[PDB]
Design a protein around this ligand. Structure first.
Ligand SMILES: Nc1nc2c(ncn2[C@@H]2O[C@H](COP(=O)(O)OP(=O)(O)O)[C@@H](O)[C@H]2O)c(=O)[nH]1
Ligand SMILES: Nc1nc2c(ncn2[C@@H]2O[C@H](COP(=O)(O)OP(=O)(O)O)[C@@H](O)[C@H]2O)c(=O)[nH]1
Ligand SMILES: Nc1nc2c(ncn2[C@@H]2O[C@H](COP(=O)(O)OP(=O)(O)O)[C@@H](O)[C@H]2O)c(=O)[nH]1
Ligand SMILES: Nc1nc2c(ncn2[C@@H]2O[C@H](COP(=O)(O)OP(=O)(O)O)[C@@H](O)[C@H]2O)c(=O)[nH]1
Ligand SMILES: [Mg+2]
Ligand SMILES: [Mg+2]
Ligand SMILES: [Mg+2]
Ligand SMILES: [Mg+2]
Ligand SMILES: [Zn+2]
Ligand SMILES: [Zn+2]
Ligand SMILES: [Zn+2]
Ligand SMILES: [Zn+2]
Lengths: 193, 37, 193, 37, 193, 193, 37, 37
């Protein structure tokens, strides 16, 4: 009717939120513009071993640069991704303010934290510094694209072993993610935790 | 095979604008204020 | 508004039509049941180098086993796939009757002919015997799944070099297609033509 | 980048049942006979 | 000169040992027959984030069906895979005898235990019953093919975050592995441990 | 003993010859340095529907920048790739001199012409200007990597329908190839021919 | 399934340096001049 | 980037039959008994 969840995607302007949600090609083709709220809702369908799951992802039209988001933006949000930019420290320092802002209005919805732009070698916010699951991502290479959504699916459904059996069509990568860098970053996280 | 037991209350309707799920008594969408068709 | 085409999927009962249209996982999740006509419409989105294309595929609820399809089934069809079963000769012999039936009602819409179940080694209808483009397919292995739709996209858009840049999420294969058999079949077709 | 020039006539509406594209004057869907909302 | 390790592949006849080692297509093309010992050595190259690793895998010519393997078979083995057949309980019951036999002659080489043929739905040895790392595998679908070798690489090199950055050419799957079954089996293992 | 062919890779210095041959990861791990000739021979194994094929690819150590290649370089060459750089017109203008040089010494071995670096948007040598089969390639994205070798396999074996059933492990891409650009280039070639 | 009929003449030996295939009478590799082992 | 410090002792030679790595003093392969070339 179906199995559908509103997901709010928040975090400073310029962190890559729009870029990230647009990797899902069908959700971009089927996006709905919400005139009264300045939002595009992207219906992202994923396919698990137990069937389809739909995340309706709310992406701002950039107003987080100029002020706070309306309440209507947060109404009936059932999960969230907070994004930051791994090359801009201010964006990471605001994460607790995005986190509180969400909490104040939600609350105890599952939240994933994503550090975007890990494709850039010149990284400022490293693992040492970093239900609040973390992933390194690179929107422009699709690196770790599935992970936030898989983790949120496993948390929402209550199945720790849920898997995506088929990947959605994703925008061709516009940037490369060096797999050896990805392994070094994986190791840094393991040596933080 | 979910959702069992993830289905909405009877008469829940999805907003064609946003597409929040609204209570059967809702005349407007709770999030975006678009009236029920 | 969008770039959307009604595609009628026709051919004898038991040729694999439903199996084939259900390989597209999102189109199955989003299928619309048309009560008055005995049809499920599967909205299949594909992603080309020039953007999304949507085929709304009309699949019967099995009435082709008992009689002819309603006119409403064919109304505003803009392309078609005729299916047959490569292990059942009668289904191939009816192809010209499906072809005429379509023509009578359409007409000069692009049509692809698909020989299904080429995964079965015990093949009865071989290339020797076979805008009427042909493909061998195997719905249950996703073998050649993209081809009918790519050919139809190229014909509808008028771009012979159109490509799908990303594949839709497809049902995990339930059967294997031997790539060496696929190469032998490719060669038989080339040695028919 | 299509469709140019694949867009429908003005006021064309898509049937929510089937989802054939219907002429602006259509009161029912031409294929499935579902009335225009 | 290079980074090369002898790997002994042992376990009852009929468990799928030969089938498994032959999934690596280049290692099969380059296999060396050792006349005096009844062995084919398959040089399996894998490609890690830190460079190539070569496992020279010793596969029997079936003599484990009739008697014990020569000492020469085990000489300078630096790691091992013990295989069993998930549909044959006797093969699993012999695992501790393969394990001891290896230990007696090696010793403290890293060993992975692999339960083969998990593609067969009619499974007799389930997770409940099962450096002794375990993986479910299916040689004929390539399911989990990389894992034993990745685990052995991580253990031999001392790098827990080693990754394979590119997969070797593998024999096309001859059988399907249902991804939903794979997820159920993954969950059973997690609910054993 | 096996099915093995010497392939000479020639073309101006800086066209990407070394970069290209190193995409095949196992052939790089197994390369043989030929001290007397200034050559590294890369044994590139490919896997066809009819079994393995090995191309022993002779790559210069850069002496084509300073003078002509020794005769020993060309001895028993059974096929060739001539490379050029799609961003450097001089390299394309020398192609007929590489072509003649090969002919003088070979002769009537199958030859593929490859225009490298098509990942660079600033392309100088376009399709309009371009057994002498042509492919656009991009060594650093692996774009069209298989094609020269597939075409050469089909020509050497005499099987026009030969296919590679599994890809060799390739170096992770260091650069992206835009699939829409690849489709535009495909179309330009079709509108040249 | 090749090679039939792609196998070399009897006694053909592959150079361990280069690895050109050499005639059985070759004492040195024809391409790189490395002596037969 | 390994192997550092995974390289064999000096003069270690690989058996062309099996291809176990043999000590420089080995005249035969330790595993398969094939004599050193
Ligand atoms: N290198 C790199 N740049 C990115 C990535 N994601 C986004 N960008 C760039 O970051 C800038 C901000 O992107 P945008 O999606 O509009 O961020 P938003 O304001 O949070 O919606 C744009 O210039 C993007 O091209 C990434 O993963 N890697
Ligand atoms: N081996 C094989 N069986 C298939 C394939 N496609 C469909 N089938 C089987 O053929 C039968 C008819 O399938 P169905 O989709 O209902 O055909 P329809 O009547 O034309 O809609 C079913 O038993 C399917 O399991 C295929 O590609 N390969
Ligand atoms: N279903 C299934 N059968 C397998 C698998 N692996 C091997 N077999 C079959 O098991 C039998 C024994 O295979 P073999 O490789 O010779 O086992 P070995 O004696 O241990 O070397 C053969 O009939 C194979 O076809 C598998 O992963 N799945
Ligand atoms: N953008 C781009 N650069 C390339 C490509 N292939 C090689 N290069 C670069 O071209 C230069 C020459 O490369 P090299 O392989 O040494 O060419 P060679 O002299 O013909 O062997 C190097 O700087 C490479 O990084 C490619 O496909 N795309
Ligand atoms: Mg934005
Ligand atoms: Mg049906
Ligand atoms: Mg065996
Ligand atoms: Mg070079
Ligand atoms: Zn709403
Ligand atoms: Zn309708
Ligand atoms: Zn030589
Ligand atoms: Zn030996």
């Amino acid at each position: 009717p179906q199995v559908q969840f509103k997901l709010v995607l928040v975090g400073d302007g310029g962190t890559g939120k729009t870029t990230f949600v647009k990797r899902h090609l069908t959700g971009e083709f089927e996006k709905k513009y919400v005139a009264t709220l300045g939002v595009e809702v992207h219906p992202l369908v994923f396919h698990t071993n137990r069937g389809p799951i739909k995340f309706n992802v709310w992406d701002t039209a950039g107003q987080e640069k100029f002020g706070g988001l309306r309440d209507g933006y947060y109404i009936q949000a059932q999960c969230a991704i907070i994004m930051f930019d791994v090359t801009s420290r201010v964006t990471y320092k605001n994460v607790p303010n995005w986190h509180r802002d969400l909490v104040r209005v939600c609350e105890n919805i599952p939240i994933v934290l994503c550090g975007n732009k890990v494709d850039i070698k010149d990284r400022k916010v490293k693992a040492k510094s970093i239900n609040l699951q973390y992933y390194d991502i690179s929107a422009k290479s699709n690196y770790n694209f599935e992970k936030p959504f898989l983790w949120l699916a496993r948390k929402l459904i209550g199945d720790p072993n849920l898997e995506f059996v088929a990947m959605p069509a994703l925008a061709p990568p516009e940037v490369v993610m060096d797999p050896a860098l990805a392994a070094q970053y994986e190791h840094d996280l393991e040596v933080a935790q | 095979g979910f959702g069992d037991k993830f289905k909405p209350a009877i008469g829940t309707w999805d907003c064609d604008t946003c597409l929040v799920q609204n209570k059967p008594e809702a005349v407007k969408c709770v999030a975006c204020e678009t009236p029920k068709p």
